[PDB]
Each structure stands twice: as structure tokens, then as C-alpha cells.
């Protein structure tokens, strides 16, 4: 058994570690700006 006070805060950590990588999958479907999508021959 584990104290649910500790388990809550352990699980928000695991959850937020996922959110940071889910950002990448959202960026294609929402068609957001991506560093690799920018066509290089265009002047800055």
C-alpha cells in the first residue's frame, strides 16, 4: 500500500512528463509551426 497524498504527486509528475512529448504529435494534426517545416531558400 502507498499513501494517496504521495501517490497523487508522484502521478502528476508522470503525467506532465508525458505532456511534454505529446506536444510533438499535436503539432502535426493542428498543423502548428515546426522548425523543420520552414523552406530554407526564402530570405529570413
Amino acid at each position: 500500500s502507498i499513501d494517496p497524498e504521495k501517490l497523487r504527486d508522484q502521478l502528476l509528475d508522470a503525467f506532465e512528463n508525458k505532456q511534454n512529448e505529446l506536444k510533438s504529435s499535436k503539432a502535426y494534426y493542428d498543423a502548428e509551426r515546426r522548425p523543420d517545416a520552414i523552406g530554407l531558400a526564402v530570405p529570413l
Binding site: 504527486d9 502528476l12 509528475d13 506532465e16 505532456q19 511534454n20
Partner: protein
């Protein structure tokens, strides 16, 4: 008593038995509780990259 290998009388002290009759392993009855951060209990958690 008698000496460690007293020639007439066998005893558990006698060198001949060493490796039989050892003391048995027990758990650590005096272990500390594994302590943990106090600042993580009082400061607000935030996400970071």
C-alpha cells in the same frame, strides 16, 4: 570449564566443528526509516521542460 579442544571431552567450542553450528542470519531490527525531501512537501510543484 575446559580448554578449547580438551582432549577427553568434545564440546561445541572444539575447532573440529567450525563451519557446522554457525549463528543464523537475521533482519536488521535497527534500520532507519528511509527519509525524504521536506521542500517537495511545502513548495508548489510546477511542470518544466
Amino acid at each position: 570449564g575446559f580448554s578449547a579442544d580438551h582432549s577427553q571431552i568434545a564440546q561445541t567450542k572444539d575447532t573440529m566443528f567450525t563451519g557446522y553450528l554457525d549463528p543464523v542470519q537475521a533482519k536488521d531490527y535497527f534500520a532507519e526509516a528511509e527519509k525524504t525531501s521536506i521542500v517537495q512537501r511545502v513548495a508548489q510543484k510546477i511542470p518544466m521542460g
